Write an enzyme that holds these catalytic residues in place. Structure first.
Site, PDB file in Angstrom:
ATOM      1  N   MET A   1       0.811  -1.221   0.000  1.00  0.00           N
ATOM      2  CA  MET A   1       0.000   0.000   0.000  1.00  0.00           C
ATOM      3  C   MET A   1       0.856   1.287   0.000  1.00  0.00           C
ATOM      4  O   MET A   1       0.317   2.389  -0.018  1.00  0.00           O
ATOM      5  CB  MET A   1      -1.096  -0.035   1.068  1.00  0.00           C
TER       6      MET A   1
ATOM      7  N   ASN B   1      -8.067  -1.170   6.613  1.00  0.00           N
ATOM      8  CA  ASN B   1      -7.524  -1.636   7.877  1.00  0.00           C
ATOM      9  C   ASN B   1      -5.993  -1.673   7.985  1.00  0.00           C
ATOM     10  O   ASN B   1      -5.470  -1.560   9.091  1.00  0.00           O
ATOM     11  CB  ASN B   1      -8.160  -3.021   8.182  1.00  0.00           C
TER      12      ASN B   1
ATOM     13  N   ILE C   1      -1.902  -0.886   8.036  1.00  0.00           N
ATOM     14  CA  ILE C   1      -1.033   0.180   8.548  1.00  0.00           C
ATOM     15  C   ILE C   1       0.417  -0.165   8.219  1.00  0.00           C
ATOM     16  O   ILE C   1       0.742  -1.342   8.045  1.00  0.00           O
ATOM     17  CB  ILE C   1      -1.194   0.475  10.080  1.00  0.00           C
TER      18      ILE C   1
ATOM     19  N   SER D   1      -8.088   4.421  15.755  1.00  0.00           N
ATOM     20  CA  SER D   1      -7.702   4.110  17.120  1.00  0.00           C
ATOM     21  C   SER D   1      -8.154   5.200  18.072  1.00  0.00           C
ATOM     22  O   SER D   1      -8.569   6.271  17.626  1.00  0.00           O
ATOM     23  CB  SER D   1      -6.174   3.950  17.180  1.00  0.00           C
TER      24      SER D   1
ATOM     25  N   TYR E   1       2.089   7.811  13.822  1.00  0.00           N
ATOM     26  CA  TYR E   1       0.919   6.943  13.745  1.00  0.00           C
ATOM     27  C   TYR E   1      -0.362   7.721  14.073  1.00  0.00           C
ATOM     28  O   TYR E   1      -1.335   7.665  13.323  1.00  0.00           O
ATOM     29  CB  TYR E   1       1.111   5.764  14.714  1.00  0.00           C
ATOM     30  N   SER E   2      -0.336   8.452  15.183  1.00  0.00           N
ATOM     31  CA  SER E   2      -1.455   9.236  15.703  1.00  0.00           C
ATOM     32  C   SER E   2      -1.872  10.341  14.719  1.00  0.00           C
ATOM     33  O   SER E   2      -3.066  10.520  14.455  1.00  0.00           O
ATOM     34  CB  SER E   2      -1.093   9.792  17.081  1.00  0.00           C
ATOM     35  N   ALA E   3      -0.873  11.042  14.139  1.00  0.00           N
ATOM     36  CA  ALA E   3      -1.074  12.077  13.118  1.00  0.00           C
ATOM     37  C   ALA E   3      -1.848  11.485  11.933  1.00  0.00           C
ATOM     38  O   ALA E   3      -2.834  12.080  11.493  1.00  0.00           O
ATOM     39  CB  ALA E   3       0.278  12.607  12.648  1.00  0.00           C
TER      40      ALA E   3
ATOM     41  N   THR F   1      -3.755  -8.408  19.309  1.00  0.00           N
ATOM     42  CA  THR F   1      -3.090  -8.953  18.123  1.00  0.00           C
ATOM     43  C   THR F   1      -1.625  -9.181  18.475  1.00  0.00           C
ATOM     44  O   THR F   1      -1.067  -8.449  19.290  1.00  0.00           O
ATOM     45  CB  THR F   1      -3.272  -8.054  16.884  1.00  0.00           C
TER      46      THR F   1
ATOM     47  N   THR G   1       1.178  -8.630  16.847  1.00  0.00           N
ATOM     48  CA  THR G   1       1.964  -7.434  16.525  1.00  0.00           C
ATOM     49  C   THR G   1       1.849  -6.319  17.584  1.00  0.00           C
ATOM     50  O   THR G   1       2.883  -5.790  18.002  1.00  0.00           O
ATOM     51  CB  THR G   1       1.664  -7.005  15.085  1.00  0.00           C
TER      52      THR G   1
HETATM   53  N1  NAP Z   1      -3.902  -3.892  17.575  1.00  0.00           N
HETATM   54  C1  NAP Z   1      -4.231  -2.832  18.352  1.00  0.00           C
HETATM   55  O1  NAP Z   1      -4.018  -2.808  19.559  1.00  0.00           O
HETATM   56  C2  NAP Z   1      -4.884  -1.652  17.694  1.00  0.00           C
HETATM   57  C3  NAP Z   1      -5.351  -0.569  18.431  1.00  0.00           C
HETATM   58  C4  NAP Z   1      -6.086   0.434  17.813  1.00  0.00           C
HETATM   59  C5  NAP Z   1      -6.315   0.376  16.438  1.00  0.00           C
HETATM   60  N2  NAP Z   1      -5.816  -0.639  15.707  1.00  0.00           N
HETATM   61  C6  NAP Z   1      -5.899  -0.634  14.195  1.00  0.00           C
HETATM   62  O2  NAP Z   1      -6.312  -1.891  13.734  1.00  0.00           O
HETATM   63  C7  NAP Z   1      -5.805  -2.142  12.405  1.00  0.00           C
HETATM   64  C8  NAP Z   1      -5.206  -3.526  12.341  1.00  0.00           C
HETATM   65  O3  NAP Z   1      -4.179  -3.628  13.345  1.00  0.00           O
HETATM   66  P1  NAP Z   1      -3.584  -5.026  13.809  1.00  0.00           P
HETATM   67  O4  NAP Z   1      -3.120  -4.952  15.211  1.00  0.00           O
HETATM   68  O5  NAP Z   1      -4.561  -6.070  13.423  1.00  0.00           O
HETATM   69  O6  NAP Z   1      -2.272  -5.121  12.895  1.00  0.00           O
HETATM   70  P2  NAP Z   1      -1.499  -6.371  12.252  1.00  0.00           P
HETATM   71  O7  NAP Z   1      -1.924  -7.630  12.917  1.00  0.00           O
HETATM   72  O8  NAP Z   1      -0.011  -6.173  12.443  1.00  0.00           O
HETATM   73  O9  NAP Z   1      -1.854  -6.428  10.710  1.00  0.00           O
HETATM   74  C9  NAP Z   1      -1.559  -5.331   9.805  1.00  0.00           C
HETATM   75  C10 NAP Z   1      -1.883  -5.788   8.401  1.00  0.00           C
HETATM   76  O10 NAP Z   1      -1.445  -4.805   7.426  1.00  0.00           O
HETATM   77  C11 NAP Z   1      -0.578  -5.428   6.494  1.00  0.00           C
HETATM   78  N3  NAP Z   1       0.403  -4.463   6.001  1.00  0.00           N
HETATM   79  C12 NAP Z   1       1.531  -4.019   6.641  1.00  0.00           C
HETATM   80  N4  NAP Z   1       2.265  -3.203   5.924  1.00  0.00           N
HETATM   81  C13 NAP Z   1       1.581  -3.115   4.720  1.00  0.00           C
HETATM   82  C14 NAP Z   1       1.868  -2.446   3.508  1.00  0.00           C
HETATM   83  N5  NAP Z   1       2.966  -1.711   3.302  1.00  0.00           N
HETATM   84  N6  NAP Z   1       0.980  -2.575   2.493  1.00  0.00           N
HETATM   85  C15 NAP Z   1      -0.114  -3.326   2.682  1.00  0.00           C
HETATM   86  N7  NAP Z   1      -0.481  -4.013   3.769  1.00  0.00           N
HETATM   87  C16 NAP Z   1       0.423  -3.874   4.758  1.00  0.00           C
HETATM   88  C17 NAP Z   1      -0.005  -6.649   7.211  1.00  0.00           C
HETATM   89  O11 NAP Z   1       0.417  -7.700   6.317  1.00  0.00           O
HETATM   90  P3  NAP Z   1       1.758  -7.900   5.477  1.00  0.00           P
HETATM   91  O12 NAP Z   1       2.872  -7.463   6.434  1.00  0.00           O
HETATM   92  O13 NAP Z   1       1.998  -9.260   4.909  1.00  0.00           O
HETATM   93  O14 NAP Z   1       1.637  -6.837   4.436  1.00  0.00           O
HETATM   94  C18 NAP Z   1      -1.231  -7.111   7.991  1.00  0.00           C
HETATM   95  O15 NAP Z   1      -2.102  -7.890   7.180  1.00  0.00           O
HETATM   96  C19 NAP Z   1      -4.858  -0.981  12.115  1.00  0.00           C
HETATM   97  O16 NAP Z   1      -5.533   0.020  11.357  1.00  0.00           O
HETATM   98  C20 NAP Z   1      -4.511  -0.499  13.527  1.00  0.00           C
HETATM   99  O17 NAP Z   1      -4.087   0.855  13.575  1.00  0.00           O
HETATM  100  C21 NAP Z   1      -5.116  -1.677  16.331  1.00  0.00           C
HETATM  101  F1  1EN Z   2      -1.399  -2.839  15.581  1.00  0.00           F
HETATM  102  C1  1EN Z   2      -0.170  -2.329  15.780  1.00  0.00           C
HETATM  103  C2  1EN Z   2       0.966  -3.021  15.329  1.00  0.00           C
HETATM  104  C3  1EN Z   2       2.236  -2.459  15.554  1.00  0.00           C
HETATM  105  C4  1EN Z   2       2.354  -1.224  16.227  1.00  0.00           C
HETATM  106  C5  1EN Z   2       1.218  -0.529  16.672  1.00  0.00           C
HETATM  107  C6  1EN Z   2      -0.036  -1.100  16.441  1.00  0.00           C
HETATM  108  O1  1EN Z   2      -1.155  -0.471  16.875  1.00  0.00           O
HETATM  109  C7  1EN Z   2      -1.300  -0.297  18.231  1.00  0.00           C
HETATM  110  C8  1EN Z   2      -0.684  -1.085  19.138  1.00  0.00           C
HETATM  111  C9  1EN Z   2      -0.896  -0.847  20.589  1.00  0.00           C
HETATM  112  C10 1EN Z   2      -1.696   0.157  20.979  1.00  0.00           C
HETATM  113  N1  1EN Z   2      -2.325   0.969  20.052  1.00  0.00           N
HETATM  114  C11 1EN Z   2      -3.178   2.023  20.218  1.00  0.00           C
HETATM  115  C12 1EN Z   2      -3.604   2.541  21.560  1.00  0.00           C
HETATM  116  C13 1EN Z   2      -2.432   3.027  22.377  1.00  0.00           C
HETATM  117  C14 1EN Z   2      -1.470   3.852  21.775  1.00  0.00           C
HETATM  118  C15 1EN Z   2      -0.384   4.324  22.530  1.00  0.00           C
HETATM  119  C16 1EN Z   2      -0.253   3.974  23.885  1.00  0.00           C
HETATM  120 CL1  1EN Z   2       1.101   4.574  24.808  1.00  0.00          CL
HETATM  121  C17 1EN Z   2      -1.214   3.141  24.492  1.00  0.00           C
HETATM  122  C18 1EN Z   2      -2.302   2.664  23.737  1.00  0.00           C
HETATM  123  C19 1EN Z   2      -4.904   3.273  21.676  1.00  0.00           C
HETATM  124  C20 1EN Z   2      -4.771   1.888  22.227  1.00  0.00           C
HETATM  125  N2  1EN Z   2      -3.539   2.503  19.034  1.00  0.00           N
HETATM  126  N3  1EN Z   2      -2.883   1.681  18.058  1.00  0.00           N
HETATM  127  C21 1EN Z   2      -2.163   0.796  18.706  1.00  0.00           C
END
Ligand code: NAP
Ligand code: 1EN
Ligand code: NAP
Ligand code: 1EN
Lengths: 281, 266
Positions: A84, A110, A112, A161, A174-176, A211, A213
């Site tokens: 992407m 979805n 990132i 998020s 990320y936040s930006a 997750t 990651t």
């Molecule tokens: N997990 C949390 O705690 C959390 C908190 C708040 C919001 N969110 C949001 O939830 C969403 C999913 O997060 P997640 O924790 O499920 O992450 P994740 O498990 O690490 O998965 C991210 C996905 O994006 C793909 N990806 C990474 N780099 C890419 C690139 N350059 N082009 C295309 N695809 C790419 C990865 O696959 P490949 O590496 O094979 O491309 C993977 O399928 C995100 O928008 C994240 O900000 C997550």
């Molecule tokens: F899904 C991810 C894979 C890799 C890195 C970040 C990723 O996303 C996240 C991983 C962990 C927390 N995240 C948050 C929240 C957060 C952010 C900062 C702090 Cl200090 C505490 C909580 C709001 C819960 N937003 N995105 C992510």
């Protein structure tokens, strides 16, 4: 039988109360679907009998998600692997996905870029890449998907998020990018409303999710209760299906109670009378 | 409470200072006896602002002309500005790329350029300015909009860039707090201002009362001088009553106990 069948799932109380049958036969794109929340969403959609097109960079992991989606009962399941970071890939992916399914009902944004928790110093390359992958590609994907979504009165689902609504240290870039999604998508939602573009936009505000990651990235830094990825994925799909403007999903009851900004909503309504757009529509 | 003497002899950068709010800020700073370095693309208009700044009583006044589309210019500009003044007390980030009110359709080039100019160059400018600002326990002033806090149609790309500034600068403010980086960050949330450019862009579209650019410019400087986190400036009393998000501040404080940063600072 399908040629002799017709009707609507979206009747009284469908605004309201979700049923898995709302996604039966729907044509859905899921980005970042090789792992985490994205993979869980693909699985829920498969169980619901949706047509699915999944994307991420890893073809091998996407193959396994597709195979499992078919086992779960997906009407059809396909993958297109790519980055992407490449706006040409993002644009072409939607055309190919739409051709693979014969249209589009729901676009789930979805993916990132890889990010770790660190203090901001001089990493401008990470700030730019975060904006390109987490934000700009979402806009490119939306532009490419819109003609098909207008035809189906479809939905755009934007995964964000709590860090896309309130500030946290260690995630500045990320936040930006997450705040940018709110500004962009909330603006076009108002534009669609006056232009009679019947495409809903759901911004999903997620807390910490278990997750692999995210758990690795926060290890020894963030000590919060992580919500389950399976339930998270379902709540996102539910919101999109119900055409909700915003989904809030977090472990804490304080979050759920406080993240909402009723004052923003009131202000937006008060400014809606201060502008004349009948020259653009 | 603000006093004009707080800016006397202070070393200040003002971006997008050839016209509008930026030019008004340069003039207020000049009257206050500050050292001033102004920037924008037009050297001819900047020359006039500098000449007028000197007439107004600026301790010193210089200009460096260039485009904020160029990240190398942005970075070199700060170094050059700090060398002319012998340091830096306040960095006023005010410039934006040219934008008009229109429905979003296909214009990805405008979305990217808005992010580059309105957001990324602010980050590049901050990185370049930080060593000098740490030395002086200085200030960063970020000029945003109500469209950087709430949603508006016709400004999608612009609004995204303004929202990005809040997310980025509010995150680093928390980081600076734990790292003992005594550099304040003021996010200015402005409503409609009577600048020539803004008035033309909104003509026949937006009809609300425009606030005066002179007073706006002063309120921004005041906020920076007082090290306020946020400045709210608008004609309407309902805006002033509603823009603030007390729940965001409460939530941030509740999460502040859920993380440990002593591994990044020790
Ligand atoms: N997990 C949390 O705690 C959390 C908190 C708040 C919001 N969110 C949001 O939830 C969403 C999913 O997060 P997640 O924790 O499920 O992450 P994740 O498990 O690490 O998965 C991210 C996905 O994006 C793909 N990806 C990474 N780099 C890419 C690139 N350059 N082009 C295309 N695809 C790419 C990865 O696959 P490949 O590496 O094979 O491309 C993977 O399928 C995100 O928008 C994240 O900000 C997550
Ligand atoms: F899904 C991810 C894979 C890799 C890195 C970040 C990723 O996303 C996240 C991983 C962990 C927390 N995240 C948050 C929240 C957060 C952010 C900062 C702090 Cl200090 C505490 C909580 C709001 C819960 N937003 N995105 C992510
Ligand atoms: N006016 C309003 O109603 C209003 C409302 C809310 C927020 N704001 C904020 O207030 C700030 C100033 O607005 P304004 O109305 O005063 O605007 P303005 O009068 O149009 O001035 C913008 C300035 O930016 C400079 N600039 C434009 N493109 C540039 C580039 N590529 N590189 C470097 N400098 C560039 C311009 O000078 P050159 O063309 O010579 O470069 C000019 O000095 C902005 O951050 C804006 O978002 C204004
Ligand atoms: F200064 C500018 C020059 C050129 C283009 C935009 C400029 O900035 C602006 C010009 C006019 C209004 N602006 C606003 C506000 C707004 C935005 C959209 C709508 Cl429909 C109504 C009110 C919040 C007052 N934010 N930035 C600007």
């Amino acid at each position: 039988m399908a040629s002799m069948t017709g009707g609507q799932q979206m009747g009284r109380g469908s605004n309201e109360e979700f049923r898995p049958e709302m996604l039966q036969g729907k044509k859905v794109i899921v980005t970042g679907a090789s792992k985490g929340i994205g993979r869980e969403m693909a699985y829920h959609l498969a169980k619901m009998g949706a047509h699915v097109v999944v994307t991420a960079r890893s073809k091998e992991t996407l193959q396994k998600v597709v195979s499992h989606c078919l086992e779960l009962g997906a009407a059809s399941a396909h993958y297109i692997a790519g980055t992407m970071e490449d706006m040409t890939f993002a644009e072409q992916f939607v055309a190919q996905a739409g051709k693979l399914m014969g249209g589009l009902d729901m676009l789930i944004l979805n993916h990132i870029t890889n990010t770790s928790l660190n203090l901001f110093h001089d990493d401008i390359h990470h700030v730019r890449k975060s904006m390109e992958v987490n934000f700009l590609s979402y806009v490119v994907l939306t532009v490419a998907a819109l003609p098909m979504l207008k035809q189906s009165n479809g939905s755009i689902v934007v995964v964000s998020s709590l860090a896309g609504k309130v500030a946290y240290p260690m995630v500045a870039a990320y936040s930006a990018s997450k705040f940018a999604l709110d500004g962009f998508f909330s603006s076009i939602r108002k534009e669609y409303s006056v232009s009679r573009v019947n495409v809903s936009i759901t911004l999903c505000v997620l807390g910490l999710i278990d997750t692999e990651t995210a758990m690795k990235a926060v290890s020894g830094i963030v000590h919060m209760q992580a919500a389950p990825k399976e339930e998270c994925a379902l709540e996102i799909i539910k919101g999109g299906a119900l055409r909700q403007e915003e989904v809030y999903y977090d472990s804490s009851r304080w979050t759920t109670l406080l993240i909402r900004n009723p004052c923003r909503k009131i202000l937006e309504e008060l400014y809606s009378t201060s502008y004349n757009m009948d020259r653009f529509i």
